[PDB]
Design a protein around this ligand. Structure first.
Ligand SMILES: CCn1c(CCC(=O)Nc2cccc3ccccc23)nnc1CCC1CCCCC1
Length: 217
């Protein structure tokens, strides 16, 4: 049995872990919305080889996964788990977490994204020749953005993307279930405390993460 202090402690731990590991601070991201790539800078990015853009995008992707791994390591529970389990959850979840995190760097006012110090739109990534993939990411980002997720809602929802007992290949499934259940309490409690119950019915379906992430892979 988990008590009110223990649950409130959990909420606060997951929120603090995200803040430490967030990588890009929200205030900085919002401050930088005014800073938008010039036509010559967009052209510059368009002119680059697919290979250069993939190297850059991969660098950013790998960096953001490290910050996910860290976030996990600070969730009180995760280190107690066995390594096979740690690995299964991160392998299956880490990209799906980056995708949710990425929504903070999307601006719905002008359909731009933060990339390498300023904002621009889809056009930046033309060299990749993955218009469709970029379109999904920009739609999905637009759809999460509409909900104005707080830092703590991100923290908590992100933790549940990771700590999922249905992932094939877990050895201590029951330890993962106990952890997920507690994170579900943490999230649902915090939602009640914040008057934010409305979001649940609007969170993207569990497949849409998995589906889209499949496309990336
Ligand atoms: C690690 C995130 N990241 C960042 C960090 C800041 C961020 O999250 N920006 C974005 C926010 C929302 C949508 C975006 C769309 C395209 C590019 C950046 C987007 N910079 N590049 C990437 C790679 C993403 C990759 C995804 C796979 C296709 C190429 C872009």
């Amino acid at each position: 049995y988990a008590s009110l202090t223990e649950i409130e402690h959990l909420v606060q731990s997951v929120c603090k872990s995200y803040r430490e590991t967030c990588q890009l601070r929200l205030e900085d991201l919002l401050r930088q919305r005014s800073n938008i790539f010039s036509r010559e800078e967009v052209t510059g990015y368009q002119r680059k080889s697919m290979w250069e853009m993939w190297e850059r995008c991969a660098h950013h992707l790998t960096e953001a996964i490290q910050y996910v791994v860290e976030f996990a390591k600070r969730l009180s529970g995760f280190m107690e788990l066995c390594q096979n389990d740690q690995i299964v959850l991160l392998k299956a979840g880490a990209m799906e977490v980056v995708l949710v995190r990425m929504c903070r760097a999307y601006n719905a006012d002008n359909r731009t994204v933060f990339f390498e110090g300023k904002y621009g739109g889809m056009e930046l990534f033309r060299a990749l020749g993955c218009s469709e993939l970029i379109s999904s990411i920009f739609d999905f980002s637009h759809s999460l953005s509409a909900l104005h997720f707080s830092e703590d809602e991100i923290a908590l929802y992100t933790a549940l993307v990771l700590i999922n007992a249905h992932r094939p290949g877990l050895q201590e499934k029951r330890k993962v279930e106990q952890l997920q259940y507690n994170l579900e309490l943490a999230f649902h409690h915090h939602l009640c405390k914040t008057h934010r119950q409305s979001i649940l019915a609007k969170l993207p379906p569990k497949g849409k993460l998995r589906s889209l992430c499949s496309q990336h892979v």
